[PDB]
Write an enzyme that holds these catalytic residues in place. Sequence first.
Site, short mmCIF file in Angstrom:
data_model
loop_
_atom_site.label_atom_id
_atom_site.label_comp_id
_atom_site.label_asym_id
_atom_site.label_seq_id
_atom_site.Cartn_x
_atom_site.Cartn_y
_atom_site.Cartn_z
N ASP A 1 18.26 4.48 -3.84
CA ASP A 1 17.16 4.39 -2.76
C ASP A 1 17.40 2.99 -2.08
O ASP A 1 16.34 2.20 -1.93
CB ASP A 1 15.68 4.93 -3.19
CG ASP A 1 14.96 4.86 -1.95
OD1 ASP A 1 15.36 5.15 -0.81
OD2 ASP A 1 13.61 4.86 -2.11
N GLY B 1 -1.90 4.29 -3.90
CA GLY B 1 -2.08 3.19 -4.82
C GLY B 1 -1.89 1.91 -3.91
O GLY B 1 -1.61 1.87 -2.65
N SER B 2 -2.02 0.80 -4.60
CA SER B 2 -1.66 -0.57 -3.72
C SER B 2 -1.09 -1.58 -4.76
O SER B 2 -1.25 -1.52 -6.03
CB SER B 2 -2.96 -1.00 -2.98
OG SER B 2 -3.83 -0.90 -3.75
N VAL B 3 -0.59 -2.57 -4.40
CA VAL B 3 -0.13 -3.70 -4.88
C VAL B 3 -0.66 -5.05 -4.71
O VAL B 3 -0.89 -5.14 -3.49
CB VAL B 3 1.57 -3.84 -4.80
CG1 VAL B 3 2.12 -4.90 -5.69
CG2 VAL B 3 2.48 -2.52 -4.70
N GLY C 1 12.22 3.62 -8.53
CA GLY C 1 11.61 4.94 -8.79
C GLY C 1 12.68 6.20 -8.44
O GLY C 1 12.37 7.08 -8.78
N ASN D 1 8.62 11.19 -13.55
CA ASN D 1 9.14 10.44 -12.55
C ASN D 1 8.65 9.21 -12.79
O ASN D 1 9.30 8.15 -12.53
CB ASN D 1 8.96 11.04 -11.17
CG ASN D 1 9.58 12.13 -11.00
OD1 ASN D 1 10.85 12.49 -11.46
ND2 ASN D 1 9.08 13.33 -10.08
N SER E 1 0.83 -1.14 0.18
CA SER E 1 0.25 -0.07 0.03
C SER E 1 0.82 1.12 0.09
O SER E 1 1.81 1.18 0.88
CB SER E 1 -0.98 0.08 1.16
OG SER E 1 -2.30 0.08 0.73
N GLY E 2 0.31 2.26 -0.72
CA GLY E 2 1.18 3.46 -0.64
C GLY E 2 -0.03 4.40 -0.44
O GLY E 2 -1.24 4.22 -0.45
C1 LIG Z 1 9.36 -6.77 -6.76
C2 LIG Z 1 8.28 -5.66 -7.30
O1 LIG Z 1 8.44 -4.77 -8.08
N1 LIG Z 1 7.07 -5.68 -6.38
C3 LIG Z 1 6.74 -6.55 -5.48
C4 LIG Z 1 7.08 -8.07 -5.90
N2 LIG Z 1 6.62 -8.68 -5.06
C5 LIG Z 1 6.28 -8.71 -3.87
N3 LIG Z 1 6.21 -9.57 -2.90
C6 LIG Z 1 5.46 -9.62 -1.68
C7 LIG Z 1 5.17 -10.89 -1.02
C8 LIG Z 1 4.66 -10.77 0.46
C9 LIG Z 1 4.73 -9.71 1.12
N4 LIG Z 1 4.25 -9.63 2.43
C10 LIG Z 1 4.14 -8.52 3.19
C11 LIG Z 1 4.18 -8.63 4.70
N5 LIG Z 1 2.95 -9.56 4.94
C12 LIG Z 1 2.95 -9.68 6.55
C13 LIG Z 1 3.25 -10.87 4.20
C14 LIG Z 1 3.22 -10.71 2.74
C15 LIG Z 1 4.88 -8.54 0.41
C16 LIG Z 1 5.23 -8.49 -0.80
N6 LIG Z 1 5.69 -7.37 -3.48
C17 LIG Z 1 5.80 -6.40 -4.38
N7 LIG Z 1 5.35 -4.91 -4.11
C18 LIG Z 1 5.12 -4.94 -2.72
C19 LIG Z 1 5.98 -4.14 -4.76
C20 LIG Z 1 6.19 -4.65 -6.32
C21 LIG Z 1 6.36 -3.23 -7.43
C22 LIG Z 1 5.58 -3.19 -8.33
CL1 LIG Z 1 4.57 -4.33 -8.73
C23 LIG Z 1 5.68 -2.07 -9.26
C24 LIG Z 1 6.79 -1.07 -8.87
C25 LIG Z 1 7.39 -1.08 -7.88
C26 LIG Z 1 7.24 -2.31 -6.77
CL2 LIG Z 1 8.49 -2.25 -5.53
CL CL Z 2 -0.91 -4.11 2.46
#
Ligand code: A1A1S
Ligand code: CL
Length: 274
Positions: A139, A24-26, A166, A55, A20-21
């Site tokens: 960063d 936005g969100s992922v 970024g 940017n 989360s930002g």
């Molecule tokens: C590599 C990568 O570019 N991205 C990514 C990959 N894979 C993951 N995987 C994950 C698994 C598990 C978790 N957790 C978080 C903590 N809880 C407790 C459990 C799951 C968090 C993230 N999260 C990711 N996010 C959070 C950011 C995302 C992204 C995108 Cl799509 C576009 C631009 C910049 C970025 Cl950094």
């Molecule tokens: Cl989240």
Amino acid sequence: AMGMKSRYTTEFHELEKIGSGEFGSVFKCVKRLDGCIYAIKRSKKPLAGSVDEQNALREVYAHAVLGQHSHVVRYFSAWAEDDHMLIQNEYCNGGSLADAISENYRIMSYFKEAELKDLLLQVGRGLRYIHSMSLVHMDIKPSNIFISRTSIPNAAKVMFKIGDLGHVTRISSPQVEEGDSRFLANEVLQENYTHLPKADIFALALTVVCAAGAEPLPRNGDQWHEIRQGRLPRIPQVLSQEFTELLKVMIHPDPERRPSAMALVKHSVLLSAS
Ligand SMILES: CC(=O)N1c2cnc(Nc3ccc(N4CCN(C)CC4)cc3)nc2N(C)C[C@H]1c1c(Cl)cccc1Cl
Ligand SMILES: [Cl-]
Ligand SMILES: [Cl-]
Ligand SMILES: [Cl-]
Ligand SMILES: [Cl-]
Ligand SMILES: [Cl-]
Ligand SMILES: [Cl-]
Ligand SMILES: [Cl-]
Ligand SMILES: [Cl-]
Ligand code: NA
């Protein structure tokens, strides 16, 4: 929210939210046509023609240039629809290094020395590539390092990958958008950009220090300055003398004395992780 005839909704099955930002969100998503899981960040679309757009597009451009390396996150696609900008990247199943640190902290643990050498070597491979391409990350920090744990069925694995591109900028850039103050080298704050790649080396050392169990790094103040005078944060463990000296010269106050990413990956201390 996206429309039910959006590229996002039609081509992907959204699963879990994973980040989360502000705007936005992922999501962890499955692409329907290939069956594989991706991370898709959807953010409010930047205003077309704006500096915010500039940017945002720099990130996508950095990904397109850098994402082939084994220690940089792969990018697949980016597009805009429904007032959102979307980036589909590889999903990393171990989350970020910040997430792995927080999990460690919760169970009263940390990365032990062999794991830290592995981290350092792999992200340094990553930086060596970025710097070879005339780019700097700007960063590096645990929340921007991602973890993939894989199983290979038929061998006759933990991978660390640099993500969040970024702040990526070119080596000779006259303006630089500063990264996280906890990891920022002093010379960058002073606006001396002669040795930008060594600001990433500095940030990487501090990232490994966080992996190794250090307390929250200061954002400013006397402790921050103490670190920039070359003193490593305290860690809850005793690392080897040679490994401690590597980390310490990586935060040296003179950037020129910090190792290159190339020297880093060739380092005798890290030959044990190769
Ligand atoms: C590599 C990568 O570019 N991205 C990514 C990959 N894979 C993951 N995987 C994950 C698994 C598990 C978790 N957790 C978080 C903590 N809880 C407790 C459990 C799951 C968090 C993230 N999260 C990711 N996010 C959070 C950011 C995302 C992204 C995108 Cl799509 C576009 C631009 C910049 C970025 Cl950094
Ligand atoms: Cl989240
Ligand atoms: Cl698609
Ligand atoms: Cl749009
Ligand atoms: Cl290499
Ligand atoms: Cl972090
Ligand atoms: Cl300086
Ligand atoms: Cl921290
Ligand atoms: Cl110990
Ligand atoms: Na990659």
